[model samples]
Target: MGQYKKLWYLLFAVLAVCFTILGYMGSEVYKKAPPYPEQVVSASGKVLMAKDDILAGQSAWQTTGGMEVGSVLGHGAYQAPDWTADWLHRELSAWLDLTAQQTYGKKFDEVSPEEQAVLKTRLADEYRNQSRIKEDGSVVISDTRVKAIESILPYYHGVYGDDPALQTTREHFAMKNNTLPSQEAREKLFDFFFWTSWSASTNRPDETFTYTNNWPHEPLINNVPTTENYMWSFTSVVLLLMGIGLLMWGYSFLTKHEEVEVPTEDPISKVQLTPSQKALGKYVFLTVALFVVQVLLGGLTAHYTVEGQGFYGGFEMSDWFPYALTRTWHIQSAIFWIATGFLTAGLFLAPIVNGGKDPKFQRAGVNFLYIALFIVVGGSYAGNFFALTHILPPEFNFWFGHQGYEYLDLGRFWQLLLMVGLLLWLFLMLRCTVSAFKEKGVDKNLLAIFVASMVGVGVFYAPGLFYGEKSPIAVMEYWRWWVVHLWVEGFFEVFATAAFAFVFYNMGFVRRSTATASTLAAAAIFMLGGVPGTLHHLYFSGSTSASMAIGACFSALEVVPLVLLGREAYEHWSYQHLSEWAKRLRWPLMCFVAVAFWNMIGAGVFGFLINPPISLFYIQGLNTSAVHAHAALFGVYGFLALGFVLLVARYLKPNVQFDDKLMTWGFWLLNGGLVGMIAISLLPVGVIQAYASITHGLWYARSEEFLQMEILDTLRWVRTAADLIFIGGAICVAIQATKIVF
Candidate 1:
């Protein structure tokens, strides 16, 4: 009891310190982020754009496929260039062209290499010396820059206008045509883009780096990774090595002292289920159904990458089912399905923890939550579609349409409902665990940890609702990751560890003390690294150097526990062979084993590949991020949820003799397909883009000209085979799930 209490104290202490630092850094972001000027004017004091125009442009960007179409501050979809970097490069080039024509009687591109270098230096100097924003809340730009802005405005107007030929990269990149029908709306959108470019090119007050730590790597504007970026990246690697050493040493002691216990028979098979547990079958069915839909949408989204303007055989899919809409649903559905599986697993496990006794009205609460979840899912999907297609009025969009930030894209009304549903889930879990908390020794400690992790999951998601439609991108980004990074990379990891430990303990595969101590210790380490590690995503999102340092060092340590996942996997694998009845649990146990494997590869290796501040500076919105995202998000959490689904399926239908063939086929195909997708398609594409980013610049790497190259197009075509294979696996799992429920 004393030992468990000490572990609990250690965990809380880690959380307390990490979150305090996180809060401080968040405040710094608000204070130091790039300013939104009251007006932007030419050097002659002629007004070009007002603060209202800039905000309206931002609103226009959101209404017209915000992050899904293009990025700002190096966050958003992969296909389009980071608009900040693109605009900066274009404006600089435009100024240089005018200067070159004046000085050398030639265009900038036609000038000699030496002459071009001189022009670039002159333009960069002008940007560096610019006042950025005046004390009167106005931006004063050079006359040359004013001409540059005018030159670029018409190009954007053509791109978002009605004519496909006028669309600069529309044929190649599959950007939706006529995104903003109003000429006034398109002008405002340009104003928004201009402001983002200013932030990328202009130096911070008394600092060598731009406001974004010189992000997006625009060589023309002299935006490159800073000294702080390089220094923290190097230091982070050193800390990662040291963290690995310490973790390995601690892990050796843990493994040496582990208590192994095996039951003579399957305990889950023998226990009678509660009514609430029985009611969870519906959730499983819905989870599987949503999983299928997510997979199909993923296939369509990937297809859009290669054949941008159309579907198979030139179906003109973008006219109705645009890439932005498909991609939005793809992302949203993944979250829905995976979360539904995890949440339902918690409800099922709660009653089991309480000695198989359902609390009064527990089943009723389960049924109600299910209905609420269904409504939120359907409503949010519809809202995102309407918002992206411009069917929803801007005034009403905030409430019922897309919010336009990635991951938190759903309408605010739906977000609040989801929050309510999560809290209700926490309540049900607490009531079921009420009796368990009174028990002495390890059971009480383990249940307490499990429940507490659920509390984090439920409460931390509220940060999604913190910002409004007009919030500064930096401020919104800060809160966005609170829900995204903290939930996916932090609390979810902790909850999974504790939940698995409790289940293994119940199965008699691990002693109670071993489960309690290891779970607590792992949770402590995860929070210590992960809580502050959220900063890694903010390094180039207008955050200070402090964010880079904290984000880099702690995020590096996040790979340490994952490095030891092999040991955990081995133990779980060994447990499967302990008894014949345990062999029935083989497929589910294999899913857990796969989770550990991919946790190391997908979350550990691929994640760390882009985690360093320098790496992200070059590859933030490139396909490299897509590689990490696909491998990690679906690879780790998706598989973990499927494991829970299989476990619940078996428990809910204990009398049924289920065949193992489908599970066997499903597991291999899913894993094999994921590996194939990454190796054959995503990784190669990302590698090429990273090379382009380093060699040319971030803008060129994501440009339609580069992305439409023959080799890259070929790689995207190669992805089709992998997608089909993955779809097959998804179907198999969905069928098996349906068989169990019916």
Candidate 2:
């Protein structure tokens, strides 16, 4: 009967169709997850490490700061060695030296030159020669090999203890006089390392590729880059250039000519704030506080990359804030602050468009959300402190302690609360805003999309609760990205476009058709490309070829819509319909402009570079991933969130005077600092590491020896300059926000 009804039906149809395919792909992830072996055995069938030990060992490693101290799969803190690479190299080297003694009937050095050469070749072949585990979850190997690998326990034990001489060189745990304390923990740690190393050394069940897609490149183990890696990377680059050419052509044809000028016509007035809306200022205050803390935590986390077991200038930061706590808080705070901005903005603005009386209960919803956020954010950080300090019981760690997946690091209870809180936010939003669509003057079609986008935010987070403590890492990773990638890269974009479109329409700068067209196009493109596009992160996480193909093809489509957005903005900016006061609008508009630029460079270019299976196979855990993350997260999402913050302050509370100096300084320093950090330091370091990985093996590339190189150290120092500049910029941004609210 109505246009809005058709819009709703069509939107739901798209979501349902996408989710249906998503479920099937999710099934494939589950299937691939189980393909890793459950146990490792000697040639004679004596178990070296069982499935139970391997799983428990994962927990032990997590309690000891899992990725914080040393990484497992390539995904952890780069400050520490990639445990897969480290253990693979050390264990194999030790085993081979021992094997040589047995084969040559003499010491490795005592053998004749000819015999030594032969032994070298033999070592290379034996280690490189991978065998598959049994379908029943067991890897049976040679007795000699197993015995040699068993020596790894004593080696790590010494390093963890910080045994007098062992401290001289960069090595295991490197915890500055700390040890496992519990013999059981030490033993479990060994099993975890064993299992991970086995994964690197062994072939997959049905493929010649290692379970990690031949990652952790070990020249000694013939862990060379695969042909698929090279072909797909080249293909993605070519595709990107072609896509850019096509989009450029489309822009030329569609616009003929377009450009910006301040208007001389009647400008729109700001909306009067409701008392309930003014109450949202408290939430904005909390958001700004989180933003400040997030920046500080980020600085502390970066300090770890250069100093490792120490702190900046050898201070006591390690005593109060170790890498584990710093990094966890850094990430959690980013989510909290960004989400806070969105939620507070929604609560404030929703009533403006809606025709109904303000819901009294909505304020209660906002208050409840604040409490929930505090409990999860504060409580989860405390839990991690207890777990790392050995105060929490191991069994309870998975529930109230640290669960240990990167973005999903919060314990289960806290994660569950976050889910409930999001649901509560959705309720508050609908109750306050649903009447907007029913009003006489409102665009019902646009409002429906807005409603749908908000709904998606709450609904999509459900995937995080899908797995348990006992789930395989591969399976955990699949669901983890559902929350991380699908939320940020998918529905978040939907929510952002809806928010921006409404703001533009209210400002009298955009036509209804243009607003609706842009919002619909962006939302559809994001979902279509971003849902299955998540498989890009699964390339080396034990996923299949189908994943790589689907991920590669669709992920690129996301860039197409983003490219069109630049032209859309150009067309909108060219309109000369407003007054001189529009010049004051430059601050927030600049933030959105930054969003577009970084979305192109960070999310488009850098993202696609790693989007392909081949390139990602080598650079998955390298600083290259960091380059893309910083650019996209801050450049796009961070700035978008910031734009919302300024927009609310400017329009909702027009009486407050913004400090021009603070705003200007914050804008330039942030953009400059970000560019400096990534371009001058991270980009170069990542490229070097990727080259090293391709040439020397992933082990050497991630080793302390490589990371500690003088040039790399210099780059890390350069990064500190960027970090300081960014902190300064963030301080200014926060101060301006504080002045507004207070």
Candidate 3:
């Protein structure tokens, strides 16, 4: 016992040291990046000709003409001296390169009348690049345009001419033909685009010459911002709090260790249901039934995704197939079946693995659980399908059951179902947990944390539906993120940390003082990191100022703990001395924790590098954001959940072993495939699209050019193939699970 206690302390101490160092490292890593998406930098240096060059036409805020007469080189806006050059370099390179044209390549004297006429035509075509004018009469293409261009590159080219980059090359081409060298001719003006430094002296002789250039020369057009809102801050806090709560549970498990000699149970060779087990058979059936429902829904979602919404959009490819009916069923059933399955296994294990005889009440309790599972799941489906069929207004908004009538123009029948379902879960959970509490007296901290965590969920989500004075979409988005970001990023930590410790306790590991303390400290630091990091979520939407702030502060803070947690996971797992099965478990856990590191370094840090709203103005909705989402979602939660559930399943039924080597291989193959798909699909596609949107040409007016799907066909197939590979591995695990339960 003493030896075990000592080991626990050492494990914890190491966890702390690991996190502190890693967190610091991650923080440093986030620092090296710019706060927003780096804007594109064109080789020709995109330049917006000053207002002085407007020899005849009305002085529009935007001009592309250089010092030379009869030359055309206008940018979208010219409030700033170098806005055109800065924006061009930051936003329009791929098009410029592909076009093989330089805007600033010629002098006016060197060009003939024919060349000038061509320049006019090019400039006329480029006018299409300007978006809606702001109140100040200044026009600028939105970030959405930039992102769309980045997201669909081949499409952009297909719709637009091959080299459609509008701003840089066109301007440079004109400059070379008609104007003096831009370096010597231009005078200073106001600020235009970001990254373009403001120079006080441009052709000003009497005053001190600053050698002023109007361009900011940013790295890319689409930049992610860093400023965080309540959603981000709240989510981080929740994660931190969740982690701390788990640490407490771990401590509780540790402080109350008692060992007894026990004989091992005989492994059940077949799927045999005894009398007691059969009494609860409905639970398993209900779960599998829901699983079937979800699978069907998944198939439907897949079909709809491929077909899109067209005349072919019937039952097979209809809206409800995935959006209202199928998706809702999949989510609700997932909670009822998959989550319930785990909870059932957990509760049953508490009795059997603890060597405590199954009581009559325990059997009765199982019966009640089955009853609740059926009621919750069955009614949820009925209500959901009913809503979809229009028996009641389709109030569905989220993935769960029927939606409420208040939002998205939903009506009553659907609303009641959602309300009733929440109430039912609340009632059932409270009763079951109360009984469990009787067996192992409720810890004040546990109950408080649980309640608070739920409250956090509610606080984060409830406001979205309020529809008060704030923008419904905006507020809802803010709170929606609160629920998603906090629940997964913050409170999820609690579940992970607590569950890990609790399971370990069942395995006979005792907690030491150092371990408990370390857990507490780690939780605190993670919370700090988690909350501010929510800023990444805000890069595309919300206030501009907030995006920048969150990028710099919260995002940087979040990475530290994840990097540190990597060390903690590595060291702890090594210390635990896992067996062959443990080796299997360790890899997924590594993947889970590695996600944190990836988020810290890759997703989190790289995400923040362009997190500022200004940066987001260029990068929002691009592949850069897509990269972060894919990595974070898969790496952190999905991997962790898969590993966690698999571990629990093994603990429930120890004898159901299969091919460990195959499982490990599957993990690598599937993960690698996913990474490959993301790279191929999003990164290059986005870069090409980004190049297309910022540049302009005769191709600008064509909508069909940017929506082509052929360019992505190969990558889409790759995504599907990767998923199939993952499902293949999952099928193996499922088979093992079925063997145990039966």
Candidate 4:
């Protein structure tokens, strides 16, 4: 009891300090974020753009698919170039050309090399050595830049507007045609893009780097990485090594006195499930169905990378089911399936953890919650499709259609409904686990940790509602990652750890004291590293350099827990040796082993690849991030969710024997396919793109010209083999899951 109390104190201490630092950094983010000027004027006082146009342009961008169609400030989908970088490069190039025409009486390309050198020097000075915005909140720019803006605006207008002349590049980039539907809307979008480029190129007051720390690697404006980028990146690598060493030393001691005591029989197999627990089988089935659809959508989204406009054999997909809609559903479905799987596991385990006793009206509450989930899922998806297709009205889009952010793409009403459902899930769990808290010994303490982690999962999601539609992009991004990074990466991990430990304890696989201490310690380590690590995503999103420094140091430690999973995997695998009945759990345990393997490779290694400030400077929205995202999000959490499904399936129907052949084929194919997908396609593409980013610039790396290169096309096609294998595995798993439920 005393030890558990001490562990709780340590856990709370870590959270209190980490969250305090997080709160302070969030305030810094808001204060230090780049200002949206009232108007942008040329040297002769011609009003070029206004604040209202910029804000309206943002809305237009969102209505026309937002992040999924393209990107701004290095936050968005990978298919399109970061519009900020693209515009900055284009403006600088155009200005240099216009200047050459005026001064040398020749085009930029027609000038001699010696003359070109002078023009480059002047271009850098104009962009990097001056502040464009004045004291009265108006941006004053040179007449050359104003001409450049005029030149760039028509190109964007053509691309987003309904123009057959721009069809080649549109098809090459896989952009939806008539995306904005009118010249007025496209002009507003240009204003938004112009502001973003200004933020990327203009130097902050008395600072060496631009407002974005000279991100996007544009040589024309000399927008290379800042010194802080290199300094903190190297520092993070060193800290990662040190963190690994210390965690290994501590983990050795924790495991030294621990031993697995698998029971003579599968204890979970013997327990009769309660009414609410039995009702959870539908949730499991729905989770599997959603997983299958998510994977299919993912495959289609990837296919769009190679073919852009065409489906398989010359069928245009963007005419109706556009790339943005497909990608949005892919991401949304992943969240839905994974969250549903976790929720079902919690509900199933609640009664078991409380000694097989169901609370009053437990089954009725479960049914109602399931219905609420279906309504939210159906309405949100339909709303996103309608908004993107323009079937939904503009005024109602934010509330009932798409909210325009990735992961948090659901409409505001749906988001509120989901939050309500999650709270109800918490209430249901608490009611079921009420008896466990009253029990004697270390079990009570373990349940206390379990319940607290569950509460975090339910409550931490509230940050998704913190921002409004017209909030500053930087502040909006800050809240976005609170839901993305803090809620998913922080609390989700804590819940998984405590829930797994509590399950193993209930099954008598580990001592109560061991489970209580280890779970708390691991949860503490995770919170200490993960809470402030949320700032890593904000490094170049208009936050201060403090975000870079603090995010770098703490995000490095987030990999520590992943590094210790090797020993845990071995312990999990060894459970099969305890008894013959345990062999029935072979596939489920294998899934856990796969989770550990991916935790190290996906979350630890690839995640760190883009984590450091220097690395992300050149590769923030590149395919490298896609590599980490796919490997980590699905590899770790997705597999863990599937493992819970298989585990619950066992107790849901103990009499029904699983198809061992199908499980074996499904497990290996999933792992093998994931490895192949990374090695054969995503990683190679990311590496080359990163090379292009370092050499040419982020604009070229994500350009239609670069992405459509023959080698990249071939590499993308190579991914089909892996996708086939992965889809096959998904089908097998779905079949097995369906069999168990039926």
Candidate 5:
């Protein structure tokens, strides 16, 4: 294929994969409505949802479609039922005739297994009847009677106090790739850092932090993720993904042939400096360096987390340089390398490899980049060190400060420095995407996509400036997701498609079939995955129509690209000439495919259950969110980064192979640890927290009476299991890394 021809091919392939995913999502498998039952209203305007119908959808355990357990209970429950509604209620409410003594603390196993199974079957039959009525009755019913649980999140869990179990759960979620608590649940504990909890006067003597604060920080718990803190990870995750993406892309672009691939002495007059041969080598060095720094520093922070207090005397008096200096550096470095690398590579490739006659613009671009990066990295590093180390009190310098009342506090001067620095970067990238003089705008669409994506990071981050710590939880939630989901399913993908396509175009490896198909397909998936699918997130916050829309739609759409692109990306790179030992990519690639089948589970699948606003009434801010984040971040985005890196590396360094033979084993450890931790931590802890909050009503000084009972004790065991698995997995990966690098 000629250069342009190859570019066309690669572009069309991406479009094809994109569309295939869209089509798959729209297919019957994804379109299948949740098996949960809705309230059955009679023809005359009365609520009469069959007991069997509601029961059919109920899950003792949530699977792919999510339990949406509470919402089904909340739909349009009339206090006074019509004869039809009355009949339905009479039958369904029969299950609640338990002893008033045990009413506050009910257990699913309170009854015999045989009896339990009977009840389950009866419930299943009832829920199925709703579906049957819809199929057979064909009455085209309306008057949507909603039964919302409004899952009550125990927002005050650690805020006013402390819980070893809770902290342990959060740690499990943070590290373990297999098993973990949900991020929301972890945040419940994280929130404790900012607020005080009612851990005081509890049997657990270690409940409350002893030092500091005047106020008891009463009414301590609120639901996890009041919408504000919910999204902090969103921005951080986006930054991480972008960084990994740039590095992954460079893996292929740089090592196209070998270390000497770029013809230093070549007489090539068409291109500027060879991007792969020159820019990539430098960029890769920075990427790997920062990534390692992150891994190492992150390890230290993890230790501090488990150990408590970074410095020897941090607990009492002596000033500490801050235990997590590397922690901050890791996150910041990832962001810098990714964004900076994107800018650096774009400058090298666009004008020269793109064969665009914009030498003057290109020259100016280099200077713009160097200056921007300097301010961003240099300034931010100093700014953060001063902030985290308590160099100033917690609220000092806005950027790196302990996220005070606003998005970017006064410590955010450096963050803003980077934010403002984008003007120069955007200007250069935009100029490269467009012509000096606007004609018929033949390439305007592509130009718009590129520029829009480049700025999307800033656009998304812009919300932080306005809202800060004071922002509404929902608004913050929206802002955080704007960058995260949007980056993957929305704008960032635009850059991804364009950059990869441009590479093939430059190298004579692309082909053009249907850019429209790919573009439209991607657009559809974004709409489907990005918007209504947001419900997956809301399942815990509180379900609303928006969440339902997000779940029913977006959840279905997110899987398509993985299913289609899974085969395309994998099979494309499996050739012997491309790289041997395709098995090394096995675990990484499996992570991607696992995301497709399990979509709705770890990410938003389980999240949808609690998000239904009504369902959220009970399970909100519990471990359920942990389950979702586990699935979404590491499952989808993290997997993407890993897989993409492997793919690019194959192309860049065909000879590169996994040195650590044990890494393959470790791969399983990491994967298993993450998913396992999610199940162990979230499923059990979620139910426990739900029981507590629902009965306790999220009051101050709320306490679980039966510490020796089945739930709490069992959760401890589950967490213990998670700790073992997580530590095991960490060890495996650490060993693997040693082998690979050595």
Candidate 6:
């Protein structure tokens, strides 16, 4: 008990320091950023570009589903170029052309080799002449700079219209048709594009590096990855290997290897039913329903990659559920279903720690949560549709329709309602765990951890509400990933670790002290590493180079525990003498075993591959991110969600009798399909994109010509085979769940 108290003290102290570092880093970003300038005016103070125009253009971008159609800050749909990269590339080309014609009195392509070298040098100088915002929030536009902006106007119009070259490119790449008929919208959209470009081109104050730390890997603008990007990447490899040894070294000391105690029948294993427990059955079904919807939507979203304007070049998916809409729902539904499962599992686990009882209002809370869940999920879906199709009033689009940020796609109204629902959930969870706090037992520690995790899950969502429509892109991204990374990748993993530990302890496979210490250690490492590691996503998103290094170093620490997760699982199994009770628990434990395996592969290998700033510099928006996304997101959270599904089903039904054959097949198929998806498609594609971006420059790598290569198009079909197998696994799980429910 004394040592456990020491562990708590150590963990909290570490977290306190980590959180302070994050707060200070955040302050740097807020203070370092230039004012969101509204105009690029002449030296005489005449307006060359209006801030209101930029704001209106941002409005036009969101209304036309710009975020859905393409990316900004290397986020959003993968099929289109990251608009920041796209705008920077085009403007750089025009700037080069203008420089060559002015200096050599010839087309840029017709210039002599020596003249070309001169033009290249001048182009670098022009890009490095970063813009500055005055105290009054205005930019002074020089004549050359004004001409540079003017030179790109025709190209911007062509991109927004039926330009022949782009039309051909779109067909070849299977990209969705995007156009702006309103000249007002087109010109304003350029205003927004130009603003983002400035962020990319401009150097940081008192620094040689851009504000984004030379992100997106464009050689054209002299934007190349820094020496630190490569240096730290190799150093992380050393830390990764060392951390593995440290984890095993700690593992030996922590294990007592005491004589195995004969397992007594646990109350939870007895299939006792209460009103709240029975009510949990509906949530299980709801979880599976949402899971299926998410799966189907995922298929549709992938199909858009192969045929962006249509489904398989036949179905007019864009006319009804466009790429933006399908993608919005696809991402949102995964969050919805996975969280519902965790919440339900938390409710399911409550009775065990509560001494076979539930909160007084647990049943009512469950039903009420269901109603709120339906409204947020259904209303958000409808609202996204309304916003896309122009059915809703334009004024209401952001307020009640599409809020237009990735992951937080639901409008503010629905976001507020969902916040209310999460709060209610925490209320009920804390209510059930209240008595455990006063009790004396192993279960009390488990309950306390569980309760605290629920609080985290609830409170961390507040960051998603921090930014709004008018927020700067950099500011919004900072808050956005707080929900995206910290909530799910950080605290959620902590919660899952504790939840799994509690289950293993209850089954007599682990000592209570072992479980407690490990849970604390994992919570400590994750929060300590993950809190400051939030800057990883900001490496090239208008943050300082210091931010990049901080993000890289700290996020590397996140991989340390992930590599060790499998060791803990294997050690637990080897240490336990399998009683008759353990055989019944084999499938349940295997579910966790699979999760551990993927934690290494998904969260450890693939996640770390992208964690470094150098690697992401080249591959941030490519299929490389797709590899990390599929492997990590589904590989960890997706599997945990399923494990809980099976665990609940096993308890609700009799004696491990819920379709063993189907469950076995489902597990293998899901794993096999994931491997196939990565090996056959995502891996090869990522390698190609990374190579191209490094060699030919970022623009050429993401261009329609490269994306539409015959082999690349052919490679896209490989995902189909994996998708089929995954669909089979999903069906098997759904069917088994239905049988248990009935």
Question: Number of clashes in every candidate structure?
Answer: 0, 3, 96, 0, 95, 1
Q: Which stretches of candidate 3 lie over 4 Å from their true place?
A: 1-471, 529-544, 547-552, 575-615, 623-626, 690-704
The sequence of per-residue lDDT tens digits that candidate 1 reaches over residues 348-425 is: 998887888988899999999999998998999899888867788877777788777888878899999999999999
Per-residue alpha-carbon lDDT of model 5 for 1-742, expressed as tens digits?
2323444455456546554543343332222322222344544566534333333211110110011111111111011011111122222233222221134344434666665555545443332232133443221122211221011123223211244544443222221111102333233222221111111101111212111110111111122222322342243234334533653465446433311122222122233343332323333344444444544554454344333333443242112322334444544554554454455445544555334455454554555556566666766666645543334443343444433211122235655666666666666656655553255534433334444456664455554454343333334344444444554445544555554444433333333222323443354444444444444443322123223333534444444343345433543243222222434445444544544434434543554455433344444334564466456554444444443433333333434565445555555665676677667754666566566555543221112223234664466456555545645654554443333323
Look at candidate 4 and give me any clashing residue pairs: none
Task: Name the regions of candidate 6 deviating beyond 4 angstroms.
Answer: 42-46, 134-136, 142-148, 151-182, 257-259, 262-266, 312-315, 440-443, 571-577
Model 5 earns a TM-score of 0.51
Query: Model 5 residue 734 lDDT?
Result: 40
Sort by lDDT, best first: what order?
4, 1, 6, 2, 5, 3
Name the better of 1 and 6 by TM-score. Answer: 1
What are the per-residue Cα lDDT tens digits for candidate 2 across 1-742?
A: 1544544556567667767766787888787653445667778878777888888888877666666665677777676677778888888777767877788777667878787778766765554453466657666677767877876667677655546776544322234344345668778877877777777666666766677767677766667666776676666567656766886786576533422333344233344566667677777777777888998888877766666567536455554466777887788788888888887777766767654246776666677888888888888889877776668888888877777678777788888998999998888888877566556764577777788888988778888899898787778888989989998778888888888787667666666666675577567657877887787877766666666666776676667666556765554344322556665566777777778778878888788767777777777788998899888888888887787787666655667777888898998899998999998999999999999987777777787778889999899878998988988888888788778877
lDDT tens per residue, model 6, 176-226: 345454677788888888777777776665776777777767777678887
For model 2, give the RMSD to the true fold. 3.3
lDDT of 3 by residue, 101-151 (tens): 355455433456676555444432332222212244233433332442343
TM-score quality measure for candidate 6 = 0.94
At residue 470, candidate 1 shows an lDDT of: 87
**Least lDDT summed over 10 consecutive residues: which range in candidate 3?**
71-80
Off by over 4 Å in 5: 1-277, 292-353, 356-400, 404-411, 421-423, 435-459, 468-481, 484-489, 497-511, 514-516, 532-611, 642-673, 679-742
Please say which candidate is ahead in lDDT: 4 or 6: 4
RMSD (CA, Å), each prediction: 1.6, 3.3, 15.6, 1.6, 16.5, 2.5
Global local distance difference test of model 6: 0.76
Q: lDDT, candidate 5, residue 286?
A: 44
- Model 2 residue runs over 4 Å out of place are 1-21, 34-38, 105-130, 159-162, 168-180, 249-270, 311-320, 440-443, 563-565, 568-577
Please report, as a residue range, the 10-residue window in candidate 1 with the lowest summed lDDT. 164-173
